[PDB]
Amino acid sequence: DNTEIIKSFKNFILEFRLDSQFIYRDQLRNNILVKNYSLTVNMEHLIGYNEDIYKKLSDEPSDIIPLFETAITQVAKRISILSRPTFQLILNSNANQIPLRDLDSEHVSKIVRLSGIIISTSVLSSRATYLSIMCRNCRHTTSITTVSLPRSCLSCGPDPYIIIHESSKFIDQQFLKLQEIPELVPVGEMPRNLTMTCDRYLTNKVIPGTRVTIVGIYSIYNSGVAIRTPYIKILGIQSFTEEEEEEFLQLSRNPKLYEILTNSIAPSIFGNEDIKKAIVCLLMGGSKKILPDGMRLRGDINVLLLGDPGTAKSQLLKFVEKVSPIAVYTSGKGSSAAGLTASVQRDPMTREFYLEGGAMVLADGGVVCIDEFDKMRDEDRVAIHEAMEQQTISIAKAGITTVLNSRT
Amino acid sequence: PSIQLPVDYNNLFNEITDFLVTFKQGPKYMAMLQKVANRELNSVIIDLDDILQYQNEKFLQGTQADDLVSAIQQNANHFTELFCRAIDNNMPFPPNLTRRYFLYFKPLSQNCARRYRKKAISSKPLSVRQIKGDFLGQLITVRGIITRVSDVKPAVEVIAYTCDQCGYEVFQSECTSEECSQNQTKGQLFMSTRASKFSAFQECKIQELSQQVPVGHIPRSLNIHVNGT
Amino acid sequence: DAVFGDRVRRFQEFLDTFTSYRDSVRSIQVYNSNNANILPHRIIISLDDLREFDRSFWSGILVEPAYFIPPAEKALTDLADSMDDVPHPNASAVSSRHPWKLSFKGSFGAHALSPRTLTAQHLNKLVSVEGIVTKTSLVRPKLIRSVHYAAKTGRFHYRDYTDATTTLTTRIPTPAIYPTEDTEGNKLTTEYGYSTFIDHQRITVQEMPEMAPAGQLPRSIDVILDDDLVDKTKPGDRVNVVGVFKSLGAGGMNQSNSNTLIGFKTLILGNTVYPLTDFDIRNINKLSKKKDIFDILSQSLAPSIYGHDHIKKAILLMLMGGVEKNLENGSHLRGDINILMVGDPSTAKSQLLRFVLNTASLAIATTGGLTAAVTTDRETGERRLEAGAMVLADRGVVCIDEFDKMTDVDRVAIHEVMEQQTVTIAKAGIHTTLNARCSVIAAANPVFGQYDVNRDPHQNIALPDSLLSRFDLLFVVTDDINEIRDRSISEHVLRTHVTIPFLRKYVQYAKERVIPQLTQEAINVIVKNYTDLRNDDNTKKSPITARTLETLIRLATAHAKVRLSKTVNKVDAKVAANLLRFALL
Ligand SMILES: Nc1ncnc2c1ncn2[C@@H]1O[C@H](COP(=O)(O)OP(=O)(O)O)[C@@H](O)[C@H]1O
Ligand SMILES: [Zn+2]
Ligand SMILES: [Zn+2]
Secondary structure, three states, rough: HHHHHHHHHHHHHHHHOEEEOOOHHHHHHHHHHHHEEEEEEEEHHHHHHHHHHHHHHHHOOOHHHHHHHHHHHHHHHHHHHHHOOOEEEEOOOOOOOOOHHHOOOOOOEEEEEEEEEEEEEEOOOOEEEEEEEOOOOOOOEEOOOOOOOOOOOOOOOOOOOEHHHHHHHEEEEEEEEEEEOOOOOOOOOOOOEEEEEEEEHOOOOOOOOOEEEEEEEEEEEOOOOOOEEEEEEEEEEOOOOHHHHHHHHHHHHOOHHHHHHHOOOOOOOOOHHHHHHHHHHHOOOOOOOOOOOOEOEEEEEEOOOOOOOOOOOOHHHHHHHHHHHEEEEEEEOOOOHHHHOEEEEEOOOEEEEEEEEHHHHHOOOOEEHHHHHHHHHHHHHHHHHHHHHHOEEEEEOEEEEEEEEEEO | OOOOOOOHHHHHHHHHHHHHHHOOEEEEEHHHHHHHOOOOOEEEEEEEHHHHHHHHHHHHHOOOOOOOHHHHHHHHHHHHHHHHHHHHHHHOOOOOHOOOOEEEEEEOOHHHHHHOOOOOOOOOOEOOOOOHHHOOOOOOOOOOOEEOOOOOOOEEOOEEEEOOOOOOOEOEEEEHHHHHHOOOOOEEEEHHHHHHHEEEEEEEEEEOHHOOOOOOOOOOEEEEEEOOO | OOHHHHHHHHHHHHHHHHHHHHHHHHHHHHHHHHOOOOOEEEEEEEEHHHHHHHHHHHHHHHHOOOHHHHHHHHHHHHHHOOOOOOOOOOOOHHHHHHOOEEEEEEEOOOOOOOOOOHHHHHHEEEEEEEEEEEOOOOOEEEEEEEEEEEOOOOOOEEEEOOOOOOOOOOOOOOOOOOOOEOOOOOEEEEEEEEEEEEEEEEEEEEHHHHHHHOOOOEEEEEEEHHHOOOOOOOOOOOOOOEEEEEEEEEOOOOOOOOOOOOOEEEEEEEEEEEEEOOHHHOOOOHHHHHHHHHHHHHHOOOOOOOOOOHHHHHHHHHHHOOOOOOOOOOOOOOOOEEEEEEEOOOOOOOHHHHHHHHHOOEEEEEEEEOOOOOOOEEEOOEEEEOHHHHHHHOOEEEEOOOOOOHHHHHHHHHHHHHHEEEEEEOOEEEEEEOOOEEEEEEEEEOOOOOOOOOOOOOHHHOOOHHOOOOOOEEEEOOOOOOOOHHHHHHHHHOOOOOOOHHHHHHHHHHHHOHHHHHHHHHHHHHHHHHHHHHHHHOOOOOOOOOOHHHHHHHHHHHHHHHHOEEEEOHHHHHHHHHHHHHHOO
């Protein structure tokens, strides 16, 4: 029965044609030549090629994805033999993404699509993928591909087998933390975090503060009466309408665009045209440049409002936080260097220390709004000096040291 | 699996007995054992210089001789028991459990070794850093400064018990004596602390001096255990 | 099995077909027999020679060490034990039983990795790793073979042991303790003098920061060393280590233990450790005789800065340095020179400091553990001192940025470093004296950001006068704008919107081979100039003390080194006096 599924995958790889070319076969051959044992399968082509296997994958991928891995491995080995390890499945998709807050007990073991920002990444971990074991009682050997060792020998007492280390294979794995965009979080709520796991070629592709699009499987694992920690098996990470493009180009073509936008910044406030234009410039921001020696010019524009109280200075920041696509608003009094900048904290779910981004790390590529700036402590200001002038944050805590970039 | 070595403990034990009987001060060690038998002295000190002198005397007399000093230096852990066994039979329940005396070896002197045309590497005042793993079980002389000493602590060598069912003294919960092993009823053992073999023990630590440390390093330390008198 | 013996014979054929290995083994044997210190039982195998001898065997060593390396070790040990009869009456039974260890050299192929590039795909392979030694563990001996005597049988016995680290192939482990009874059941007499023990230590290697990208934690990996490699390195050493990257234990495979987080432990079984012209000299000596060579060398320094000729000259003289002396009374005289920079922060101090740090061969950057009087603890609890920049820069130069921001403890420690060129460490249970013969270059900035040119740094920066007096030269720079000159210097910036390799050899040779002494020519000049400076009661950057005379002597010696003359002359003293007068104004 599953032989038909394998044959269908083989056809979808070898014989599928798009743009008058065998795009999947050619891309897998190119990956083999590069020696990258991974295949990026597009779900939009899969649904158009065969709907029944798509239904099976969408409803019960539990056996389908082992079939995907083994079929891709076999087909790639056939291609390598024709031209002259287990190949990883990578999924690219553009279907509608379910909100993170809408994930429930009904999407168990179902492949879903998500989007969010990475706030923490763990160190790499080595996991077994192929084992050879020997019985200590009688030296009988066998191979095994959650996995657990056999309780009895196949030829010896309970638990007789031991692992032959020099005849086994292992793979890497990384643990990731995803959360919803704070701009999409209504006030009065802490953004929901989500645990994600990736392995082999999908590791180390993101750092905290990165905004990504996810294709993966919703699942749970045991780590409250029956509060099983949910986690995501990462399958694919990605990181305007034509009429919208025309509308915004006409807006650019407007002979009075600059003044229109200047008035558009806080129209419910009077005057203050100079600071309005300066805030417009801040919203657009500068252009990045790189020196020939490798150093980067900070393109961010930082403006200090230093006037008398009651001059609509707070209202301007609160309005920008609405307007900017990426915006973070926090008070100087209620913040700290460990909160504004990155910090190292231990993850209770995986019992490991994690590098966790701060508020300014979350604002990477955007604008942060800070108020009562004169009232923060000097150490926080020293860290903000680095954040402003070098676009980096230096962390030296416990027994680890690291530097993390922040284009805020 | 069996292996062979040139060491012969029969010849070494006979040489030890002959040295004890013959080496004059009457014999020095026979006089010491007489004092011990007179209950005047509590511990016995064995001088390797005397053994080397006896070996050189045998060499000059043309008689048979084996390097007993080097044998003791290499495996002092067993040669201490050999000397104790020799004394237990030559001094004027298993015996080892009831012994209350102590024995120690004092090192060779460099002048004596040079006078007998031999190199005394073991007694050379090396530092704790220069002691490799090859010296495990070997009698060595270490030069350094003591940095920590612990107070006297109890150190029981053999724990003693008494049994109500048979009255035998048991040395190490159930009596292992022959009478209780034969009988179906066994008397529960209780710790006879006053009969237990207490030994005086202190913990000491020695450390390198400043002139012994290499460039940019920290002076290493070593643990010294002191027992008996 | 038969394959093990086949590979043993193959390695014996490798050793015989290239006698250049076993002849060195013979030389080591002869040297060891003559000393009845001992040379280690280790030789280095050229990977290219093994590749050209047996491609399969070399590929097996690189890719499947567990099945190829132990046969090679056995073959080498057999060749060593069979090349001579070992006529030693007693050493033959102990010292001759140590197995011989292999080392590798040459091209590593694709196995040239960093602690970041090292991944699970490289497991069970012999790889070479480049990195820095963060810390070292405590050394302990390890039992290998136990020898004991069975008194009741009248004959000796022996037993061997295996461990997952020392055994490349997964042999059956032997957790048995030293035996008390043998097969015959008789009580055994322990033979410590004939048992075999080998020392062992663990070190951690981390990827060098020079290639580490930002936004990720640094990558580290543990390396195991034994016998002769047990104490060959210290923390902070750049190292290239070759070893087998091997995994150990189990990632929760026993019983259920189905936690997703648990991974397998991995490490490297290290086996080889690599700690990290006349034409030029003659050209240097020939160039030294030109009258303009000093100015040419000064202009080659700091090409990114226009003007500031005196600062470049001072930097060159400081790099040249003076000459230390010893006296019959046991006293020692300082020869090195220090430089301090003061003024507006962004104005050219960072660029000059960058050039000095990049150009000098032993330049260490510092900013507000430099005292080298703090301990770092191992994982087992024991602790060791960590080196400080002021101590590591011995016979070098110290570069300080934001010198004003350094703490008072650093100041009171650096007083002795700058004055007596030494560090007096006095701590609880640790007392030692270390040499700190380093030249110091530092930059400091005023609190207001704008330097008050009408006043000395004693009020603009308000550092202690005792600390300031330890700097031989002081310079104040501030962007006093002249529009045409600023345009001329900034056109190069707008365009962005003697060779240094020879100069470094020049400085190295001059400081290495030239040791100038004083001469009657400079004595009168020094006395006259010092007396004139003392008589000059006009305001100056600093008062005139004997330290000024010492600075004059040091500058004269440095200028003589620039001239590569072993005797000072009047021109050196005149140049030193002119430079000091420029600095004091
Ligand atoms: N030009 C203006 N047009 C309209 N409202 C203004 C203007 N200037 C100030 N305001 C009023 O002032 C308030 C903002 O004051 P705010 O800047 O928060 O005080 P503070 O400077 O103490 O933080 C708003 O409620 C706003 O209505
Ligand atoms: Zn079995
Ligand atoms: Zn009893």
